[PDB]
Amino acid sequence: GIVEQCCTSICSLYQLENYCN
Amino acid sequence: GIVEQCCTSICSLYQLENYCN
Amino acid sequence: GIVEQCCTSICSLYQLENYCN
Amino acid sequence: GIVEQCCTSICSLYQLENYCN
Amino acid sequence: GIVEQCCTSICSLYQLENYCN
Amino acid sequence: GIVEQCCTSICSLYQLENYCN
Amino acid sequence: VNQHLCGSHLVEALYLVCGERGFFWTP
Amino acid sequence: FVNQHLCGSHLVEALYLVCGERGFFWTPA
Amino acid sequence: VNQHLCGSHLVEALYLVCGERGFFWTP
Amino acid sequence: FVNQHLCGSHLVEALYLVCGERGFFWTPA
Amino acid sequence: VNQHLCGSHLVEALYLVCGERGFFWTP
Amino acid sequence: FVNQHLCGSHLVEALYLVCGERGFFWTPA
Ligand SMILES: [Cl-]
Numbered sequence: 001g002i003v004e005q006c007c008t009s010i011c012s013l014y015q016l017e018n019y020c021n
Numbered sequence: 022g023i024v025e026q027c028c029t030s031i032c033s034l035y036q037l038e039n040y041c042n
Numbered sequence: 043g044i045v046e047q048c049c050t051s052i053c054s055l056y057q058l059e060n061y062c063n
Numbered sequence: 064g065i066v067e068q069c070c071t072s073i074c075s076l077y078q079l080e081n082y083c084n
Numbered sequence: 085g086i087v088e089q090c091c092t093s094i095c096s097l098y099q100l101e102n103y104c105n
Numbered sequence: 106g107i108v109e110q111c112c113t114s115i116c117s118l119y120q121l122e123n124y125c126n
Numbered sequence: 127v128n129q130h131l132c133g134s135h136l137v138e139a140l141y142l143v144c145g146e147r148g149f150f151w152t153p
Numbered sequence: 154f155v156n157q158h159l160c161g162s163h164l165v166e167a168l169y170l171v172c173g174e175r176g177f178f179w180t181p182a
Numbered sequence: 183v184n185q186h187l188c189g190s191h192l193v194e195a196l197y198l199v200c201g202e203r204g205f206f207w208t209p
Numbered sequence: 210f211v212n213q214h215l216c217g218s219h220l221v222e223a224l225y226l227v228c229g230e231r232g233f234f235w236t237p238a
Numbered sequence: 239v240n241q242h243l244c245g246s247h248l249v250e251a252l253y254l255v256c257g258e259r260g261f262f263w264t265p
Numbered sequence: 266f267v268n269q270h271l272c273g274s275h276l277v278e279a280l281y282l283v284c285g286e287r288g289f290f291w292t293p294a
């Protein structure tokens with residue numbers, strides 16, 4: 001999920017974009 | 022939509038939770 | 043105070059509302 | 064009030080601290 | 085400037101990075 | 106730098122103002 | 127009212143209001 | 154509503170939303 | 183100017199400016 | 210783009226900016 | 239559109255977008 | 266003024282308020 005990927009780990013812009021619609 | 026209902030008028034938290042899942 | 047209750051501990055919406063006017 | 068003084072014009076931090084306790 | 089380009093229209097992150105160093 | 110001075114250490118308003126233009 | 131800035135405030139507010147249940151943002 | 158720690162400007166904004174026209178007092182001392 | 187959004191920014195700014203002494207928000 | 214931990218309303222706002230007109234889903238569960 | 243509030247949102251957005259490289263804010 | 270740690274977008278916004286029309290530079294490197 002987004003919290004584990006981008007809040008506990010660091011996300012790239014692409015990983016962050018996996019959560020767009 | 023949320024933008025029309027809430028950007029000209031003030032929405033409370035009770036009106037805002039309408040837009041939750 | 044509000045910092046001990048809601049920043050060091052977690053507050054419910056009602057506890058948070060104890061600090062409204 | 065703070066809304067009328069500061070929402071049409073820019074208030075500095077010095078003007079804003081007027082509204083502190 | 086950034087204020088004129090982006091405060092009336094929406095700037096994307098790609099348009100915004102123009103203003104980075 | 107500003108991160109070491111004001112994020113890892115605490116800055117006064119004057120130290121914070123060292124980073125204005 | 128600039129809809130984009132308002133949107134920013136709206137998704138913050140919805141963060142707080144919705145909490146666990148979350149929300150979909152679809153302009 | 155969110156069940157979590159709220160601090161600083163985040164706590165203040167939460168009070169803003171939740172209290173509405175009542176307003177609030179922010180006394181962190 | 184939407185007074186509510188401005189208010190949001192105002193209470194943030196007052197958080198910073200007032201610090202320890204705090205403030206009352208009374209629309 | 211920033212390379213760092215993004216949490217809570219910060220993460221949400223980041224999604225807002227990055228996703229733009231696509232919008233996004235915020236499912237923290 | 240109140241340029242000052244928009245500015246607030248702009249420097250936040252630029253924080254995210256620019257990251258390491260940073261930016262200059264010069265109204 | 267607040268006497269505390271200011272980081273990330275919080276630090277940036279603080280600079281925004283405090284510097285005003287002078288503007289500021291945000292060089293976190
Ligand atoms: Cl705004």
Ligand SMILES: [Zn+2]
Nearest residue numbers: 131135187243
């Ligand atoms: Zn705003």
Ligand SMILES: [Zn+2]
Nearest residue numbers: 163218219275
């Ligand atoms: Zn924060």
